[PDB]
Specification:
The structure is cut from a larger assembly and holds 8 protein chains of 8 kinds.
Chain D (H helix, E strand, L loop, with lengths): L3 E2 L12 H14 L12 H9 L21 E5 L7 H10 L5 E5 L1 H4 L23 E3 L6 H15 L5 H4 L9 E3 L24
Parallel strand pairs in D: 2-3, 3-4
Helix pairs in contact in D: 2-5
Chain E lengths: L3 H8 L5 E5 L5 E4 L5 H11 L3 E9 L6 E8 L11 E7 L5 E2 L9 H12 L2 E2 L36
Chain H lengths: L6 E5 L11 E6 L4 E7 L7 H5 L4 H8 L7 H15 L6 H30 L3 H20 L9 E2 L2 E2 L8 H22 L3 H7 L7 H6 L5 H4 L7 H4 L20 H24 L26 E8 L2 E8 L8 E5 L1 H5 L3 H5 L4 H10 L4 H4 L2
Antiparallel strand pairs in H: 1-2, 2-3, 4-5, 6-7, 7-8
The chains are: A alpha+beta (141), B alpha/beta (165), C mainly beta (95), D alpha/beta (202), E alpha/beta (158), F alpha+beta (163), G little secondary structure (19), H alpha+beta (371).
Bound molecules: 1,2-distearoyl-monogalactosyl-diglyceride, ligand PGT and iron/sulfur cluster (3 copies).
Cofactor (chain F): [4Fe-4S] cluster
GO biological process, one term (chain F): photosynthesis, light reaction
Keywords (chain F): 4Fe-4S, Chloroplast, Iron, Iron-sulfur, Membrane, Metal-binding, NAD, NADP, Plastid, Plastoquinone, Quinone, Repeat, Thylakoid, Translocase
Chain lengths: 141, 165, 95, 202, 158, 163, 19, 371
């Protein structure tokens, strides 16, 4: 019973009038990000309302799960993925901001997403643009 | 032959009412289209306008459509030598999509692409599928032609004598 | 002539044995320098998940080694020392 | 059980002349001018080049290759996508304007192909990175098979309605936290072979 | 049998060790890492114009890392050129081998590959960084005891 | 001083001549017939040893699994069980996934019973990846020859040279 | 095992102009 | 002028002039290249690691994926490493077939170099013009081997199968047509004023620098060096045919273009001479040809280095066996990977539009640069 998933991942305080900025000359040329069909981890501040990404804010990690919707997401499932992301970020304390660390974090996050899909937490999103089942076809147990 | 052949094969024709009447009367329809494709969407689009939801089935890898579509079927995922052989069981595709459709949908339309590779009996079953499942319409591309023409699939499969058009 | 007297110098395990790697012994081993990860990285968890399978065994000048490849992982197998591996009982893996 | 589910939606629209024929003509226009990205990575691109050439013509379907993503409708992924290239591939796909279509050509683009077993850097299929409309099997697929895959893509394109547009825009959900990682500048700064003769340091 | 280059080196008093010949009879010599930077210049002085290939390989897992150099001569009027293989062995714990980029420029990329795949650090190489693998990668993939850290996009296409 | 202008004249007429030569060489191709094969209205007849989709004979398979070992990726899946009455290997399932297949030809070459063959069936594109997992029924289907399709013009690459 | 050969060879430049 | 004036542009993996996925970090001072940094490895599939844990009959399909234009050269080096290790002889007919296929692949590789080179210069029609005849080469290969590319035709101790009936006359007719096509190419391109003024004085390389940098093939031969590994190592049957090593004295890109055209002509002469004097007898070695479990080729326990004259230079294999089916070490010496490292030296103090000409002068394909 009880509330469950009571961690309730707290995001950083939302900024206003954030404008899109490219990476500087010394920090540019690198990915400082891990992008993949279901997960985008950016060392940047991305706001969803105006679609503005400030990449000079390297002290923030913005996580976007399922941009091209292949799964149907409730708020509880989003909170579960977000608390797992927070725990993974706190677990990797002291690691560099290189692409390798963020790719590892995205890999564990997608393994968690596949585990949630196979456990029944989330289902494939019909009425999607494509129906290819990148995590596996519907199968019986 | 010419004259009529070289005259407009335009896609503004009023064949669409006849097409919908045929797809409602004859549940299973064999369709013939231009080789370069893209002139089928005018006819499938109105079916999707009536609430029908499409299930795209490739007939090349269909694999005995009776147990592939109307039964739970065993499939082995491809190991590359790193895993032991696993036998997975998949739900019946058309019935899974039927029971998972929203209640407001008119039904399911099975778009069988490249149905020329199927044998005679497979086409017989594909034509007789809507009899077993009432809310299923069958559309199968059985070839290519200069202009879009459709026939009952039972006539092509051999259940009905092929009346001259 | 044989290397010692039998055709093979006799090994600790048999080919196809399901093995599981020590965490601590692998971490202080020389071979971990090939990966170079810090201690808190979570890329090598499946190593300890009792998935490995021995394909071959050989006596190199640095000791006895087994070429292990983990079931379900489509990557190249690795040569690991026999002291840091345990022969296990079951596969303990489902796809 | 990895099940599937249909979300809740409203009734479509229904129209007599204007909207339906406008949608059909838009679909037909996007049929005949599927400009490829000219995205080439590996050996399969050679066969892609064989589809630009004279024996099999790209121009009959339209399909003029455009270098910039902003001018490209279709990305025809030819070649293995390594770990070093996959973020670049996803950017290039994202920078393409909607509506956009993806064809995974080659066995290395569908599931990794020969590198599905022992390669430590090959992405096993771009369906893990980009939504693929048509899968094209074959190591160097014959250019006629590429044209057949493009024909099937046209078959699916002509079936589109206006509702599919709201299936295409991203939902754009975000979540921002501090990371307390170590920030480091780029290793590849562009300094190369400049004042090299003074870099001996005996 | 003593090779031509080995006889020349023992005539000039240069320390080395002859490991034999390959299947084609090309001499194979072993050079200590501390003397390799001095011996490479003398090798060019002998007349080895062409650094045909630079390679690195694993002698044994958990063992020594060997760096291989193939050398030959490009000259007018020579019928059969003289080719030599030379191997320098470094420990796995901290492999350090001097760079021959200041003798033959052809090593410029190749030694970087030897750094990218096996982790052999070359001292006087001015631009020693990963060339084939991503620049932020941790680990040397071609070592016999390397283990891939379970990336999602490397796993099976489900 | 005049010789400089003269040399400028002769090194300008040469460029005009060579530009006209490029124009003539390119425009002489307008009098030549096109080489384009108009797919899909015209199809090129494949060679006698073209490596396409696999055809599998279920009755001739003995589940010896040498086709798996000869494969570069161990792709073919041979699910079999032992028939204890006769102690012979009974085949249950045979599956080749063509999303991973490279059509190298090792299986059809090293099969001892010769039940695996290469057909001319290219153009196996599908909308769904998992539809490329052909089982023993899909592999057993006879390929559709382009010579049997009479709505297209089958193109032969070279003269038959069988005289 | 063995030993590193040509450890100055104990003669090397025996008489004549040294190399 | 050190910073905030120097534009660092990433002419990277997605660029029409970048053959494949080569990346150049180019620093420009008003269309003048101060320097450039080559980033490669966007196609690194780890093929040296896949070379182990694979038998030769399993690794042979993987071989054609480096240098996918000249596939027969990679297949030849892969099948002649272990057959030299095991002392396997090759029959004369198989050797002649190998020579013919290698020369045809050299012709095709030089063609599909000329195409992208002139495209990068600015002419798009020569791409279609080379493809008109590379399709004929593909037709010959598919008639003989069974596929256009990735032939899987070369085998240890011979070839996969004998030439089909009616192949010699078809190849001779192809040679007769291709000589005319090459004359048309030289008429259209070679003296063009725009082509010359784009090519005549770019990328001057000294012979000493070419030797020191490890260059091979048309790169090294275009600096006054007559170094061909077909005549130095006496490969196959190249000592029996009359042919000339194409080399030029000047170092510019025009010398490389002329060298590749002359190499195509000499290759055509080699096919003509080989088909005129084709021998009989077997093609597969009957000694090695022998439901039962089938082992692969067990490599002997010794090191070996084998070289071949690829159209891009010298392609090498360093093979260390382990008395087992899987080789212990399989190092690939790629000609393009070593020819590419001279590019920052050449493009330094040059212009932005000259980078395309320099990179098209070098026969670089990214599938062979990384492995
Ligand atoms: C239609 C006309 C098509 C050709 C015009 C393109 C430009 C052109 O001729 O440049 C091609 C060349 C470029 O020529 C270059 O520029 C100058 C022109 O005199 C100097 O001659 C330079 O030395 C020469 O290299 O132009 C010419 O040589 C003049 C050709 C005149 C043709 C008429
Ligand atoms: C810088 C502008 C372009 C310059 C070059 C243009 C291309 C020149 C033509 C190259 C192809 C030659 C094709 C030969 C055809 C043989 C059959 C034929 O009809 O031949 C006649 C050639 O017929 C033609 O006229 C060819 C067509 C040219 C016009 C089309 C191109 C316009 C540009 C012969 O008559 P003539 O050479 O005396 O004719 C030319 C003369 O000036 C007429 O008074
Ligand atoms: S199918 Fe894959 S391995 Fe084969 S050429 Fe294409 S990209 Fe390379
Ligand atoms: S080699 Fe032939 S007979 Fe043996 S298992 Fe494979 S398909 Fe069956
Ligand atoms: S054709 Fe080659 S890759 Fe395909 S299943 Fe047969 S052996 Fe495997």
């Amino acid at each position: 019973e009880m509330k469950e998933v009571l961690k309730r991942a707290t995001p950083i305080e939302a900024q206003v009038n954030v404008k899109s900025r490219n990476l500087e000359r010394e920090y540019g040329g690198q990915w400082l990000s891990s992008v993949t069909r279901h997960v985008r981890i950016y060392a940047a501040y991305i706001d969803p309302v105006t679609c503005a990404m400030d990449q000079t804010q390297m002290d923030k990690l913005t996580l976007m799960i399922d941009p091209t919707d292949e799964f149907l997401w409730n708020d509880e499932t989003l909170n579960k993925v977000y608390v797992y992301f927070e725990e993974l970020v706190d677990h990797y304390e002291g690691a560099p901001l290189t692409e390798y660390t963020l790719r590892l974090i995205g890999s564990d996050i997608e393994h968690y997403i596949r585990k949630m899909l196979y456990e029944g937490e989330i289902k494939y999103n019909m009425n999607s643009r494509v129906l290819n089942f990148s995590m596996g076809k519907p199968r019986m147990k | 032959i010419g004259i009529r052949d070289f005259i407009g094969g335009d896609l503004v024709k009023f064949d669409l009412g006849t097409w919908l009447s045929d797809v409602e009367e004859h549940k299973a329809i064999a369709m013939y289209s231009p080789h370069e494709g893209g002139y089928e969407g005018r006819y499938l689009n109105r079916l999707r306008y009536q609430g029908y939801h499409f299930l795209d089935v490739s007939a090349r890898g269909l694999g005995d459509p009776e147990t592939t579509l109307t039964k739970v079927h065993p499939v082995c995922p491809p190991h590359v030598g790193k895993q032991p052989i696993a036998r997975w069981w998949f739900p019946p595709e058309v019935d899974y999509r039927l029971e998972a459709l929203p209640s407001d949908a008119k039904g399911l339309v099975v778009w069988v692409i490249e149905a020329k590779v199927l044998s005679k009996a497979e086409l017989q079953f594909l034509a007789m599928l809507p009899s077993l499942r009432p809310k299923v319409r069958v559309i199968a591309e059985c070839g290519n032609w200069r202009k879009v023409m459709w026939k009952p699939l039972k006539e092509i499969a051999g259940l009905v004598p092929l009346q001259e058009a | 002539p044989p290397p010692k007297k039998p055709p093979k110098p006799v090994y600790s395990m048999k080919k196809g044995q399901i093995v599981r790697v020590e965490r601590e012994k692998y971490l202080d081993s020389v071979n971990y320098l090939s990966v170079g990860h810090p201690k808190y990285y979570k890329g090598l968890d499946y190593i300890y998940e009792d998935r490995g399978e021995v394909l071959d065994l050989r006596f190199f000048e640095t000791g006895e080694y087994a070429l292990v490849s983990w079931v379900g992982i489509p990557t190249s197998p690795a040569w690991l020392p026999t002291d840091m591996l345990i022969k296990s009982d079951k596969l303990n893996y489902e796809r | 059980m990895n099940s599937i589910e249909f979300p809740l939606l409203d009734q479509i629209a229904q129209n007599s002349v204007i909207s339906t024929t406008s949608n059909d003509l838009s679909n037909w226009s996007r049929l005949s001018s599927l400009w490829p990205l000219l995205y080439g990575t590996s050996c399969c691109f050679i066969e892609f080049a064989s589809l630009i050439g004279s024996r099999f013509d790209f121009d009959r379907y339209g399909l003029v290759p455009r270098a910039s993503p902003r001018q490209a409708d279709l990305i025809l992924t030819a070649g293995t996508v390594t770990m070093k290239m996959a973020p670049s591939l996803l950017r290039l796909y994202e920078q393409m304007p909607e509506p956009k279509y993806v064809i995974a050509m080659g066995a290395c683009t569908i599931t990794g192909g020969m590198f599905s077993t022992d390669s430590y850097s090959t992405v096993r299929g771009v369906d893990k990175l980009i939504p693929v409309d048509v899968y094209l099997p074959g190591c160097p697929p014959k250019p006629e098979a590429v044209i057949d895959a493009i024909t099937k893509l046209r078959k699916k394109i002509s079936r589109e309605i206006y509702e599919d547009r709201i299936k295409s825009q991203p939902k754009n959900r975000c979540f921002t936290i501090n990371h307390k990682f170590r920030v480091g500048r780029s290793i590849h700064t562009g300094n190369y072979d400049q004042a090299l003769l003074y870099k001996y340091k005996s | 049998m003593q090779g031509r280059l080995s006889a020349w080196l023992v005539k000039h008093g240069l320390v080395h060790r002859s490991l034999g010949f390959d299947y084609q009879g090309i001499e194979t010599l072993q050079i200590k890492p501390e003397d390799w930077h001095s011996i490479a210049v003398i090798l060019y002085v002998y007349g080895y114009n062409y650094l045909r290939s630079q390679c690195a390989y694993d002698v044994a897992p958990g063992g020594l890392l060997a760096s291989v150099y193939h050398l030959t001569r490009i000259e007018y009027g020579v019928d059969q050129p003289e080719e030599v293989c030379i191997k320098v062995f470094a420990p796995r714990r901290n492999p350090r081998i001097p760079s021959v980029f200041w003798v033959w420029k052809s090593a410029d990329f190749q030694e970087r590959e030897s750094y990218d795949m096996f982790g052999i650090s070359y001292d006087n190489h001015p631009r020693l960084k990963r060339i084939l693998m991503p620049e932020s990668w941790i680990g040397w993939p071609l070592r016999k005891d390397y283990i891939v850290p379970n990336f999602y996009e490397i796993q099976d296409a489900y | 001083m005049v010789t400089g202008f003269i040399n400028y004249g002769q090194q300008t007429i040469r460029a005009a001549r060579y530009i006209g030569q490029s124009f003539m060489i390119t425009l002489s191709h307008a009098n030549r017939l096109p080489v384009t094969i108009q797919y899909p209205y015209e199809k090129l007849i494949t060679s006698e040893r073209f490596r396409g989709r696999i055809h599998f004979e279920f009755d001739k398979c003995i589940a010896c699994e040498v086709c798996v070992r000869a494969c570069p990726i161990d792709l073919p899946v041979v699910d079999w069980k032992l028939e204890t009455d006769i102690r012979k290997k009974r085949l249950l399932n045979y599956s080749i996934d063509f999303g991973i297949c490279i059509f190298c030809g090792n299986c059809v070459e090293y099969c001892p019973t010769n039940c695996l063959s290469m057909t001319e069936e290219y153009e196996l594109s599908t909308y769904d990846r998992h539809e490329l997992n052909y089982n023993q029924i899909a592999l057993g289907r006879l390929p559709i020859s382009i010579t049997d399709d009479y709505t297209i013009r089958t193109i032969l690459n070279s003269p038959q040279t069988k005289e | 095992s063995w030993e590193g050969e040509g450890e100055n060879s104990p003669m090397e430049m025996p008489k004549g102009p040294p190399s | 002028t050190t910073r905030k004036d120097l534009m660092i542009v990433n002419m990277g993996p997605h660029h029409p002039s970048m053959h494949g996925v080569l990346r150049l970090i180019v620093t420009l001072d008003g269309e003048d290249v101060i320097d450039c940094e080559p980033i490669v490895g966007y196609l690194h599939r780890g093929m040296e690691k896949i070379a182990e844990n694979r038998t030769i009959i399993q690794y042979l399909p993987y071989v054609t994926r480096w240098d996918y234009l000249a596939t027969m050269f990679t297949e030849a080096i892969t099948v002649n490493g272990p057959e030299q290790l095991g002392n396997i002889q090759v029959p004369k007919r198989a050797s002649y077939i190998r020579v013919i296929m290698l020369e045809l692949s050299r012709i095709a590789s030089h063609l599909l170099w000329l195409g992208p080179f002139m495209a990068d210069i600015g002419a798009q029609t020569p791409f279609f013009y080379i493809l008109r005849e590379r399709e004929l080469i593909y037709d010959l290969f598919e008639a003989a081997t069974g596929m256009r590319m990735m032939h899987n035709y070369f085998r240890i101790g011979g070839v996969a199968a004998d030439l089909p009936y009616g192949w010699i006359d078809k190849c001779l007719d192809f040679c007769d047509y291709f000589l005319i096509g090459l004359t048309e190419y030289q008429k259209l391109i070679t003296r063009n004023p725009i082509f010359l003024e784009r090519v005549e004085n770019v990328g001057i390389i000294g012979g000493e620098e070419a030797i020191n940098w490890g260059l091979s093939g048309p790169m090294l031969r275009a600096s006054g060096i007559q170094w061909d590994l077909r005549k130095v190592d006496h490969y196959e049957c190249y000592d029996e045919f009359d042919w000339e090593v194409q080399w030029q004295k000047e170092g510019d890109s025009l010398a490389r273009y002329l060298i590749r055209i002359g190499e195509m002509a000499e290759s055509v002469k080699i096919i003509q001479q080989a088909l005129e004097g084709i021998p009989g007898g077997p093609y597969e070695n009957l000694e090695i040809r022998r439901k039962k479990p089938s082992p692969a080729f067990e490599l002997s326990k010794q090191e070996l280095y084998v070289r071949v004259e690829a159209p891009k230079g010298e392609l090498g294999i360093f093979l260390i066996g382990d008395q087992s089916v899987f080789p212990w070490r399989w190092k690939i010496r790629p000609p393009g990977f070593i020819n590419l490292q001279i590019l920052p030296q050449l493009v330094k103090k040059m212009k932005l539009a000259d980078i395309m000409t320099i990179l098209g002068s070098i026969d670089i394909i990214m599938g062979e640069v990384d492995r």
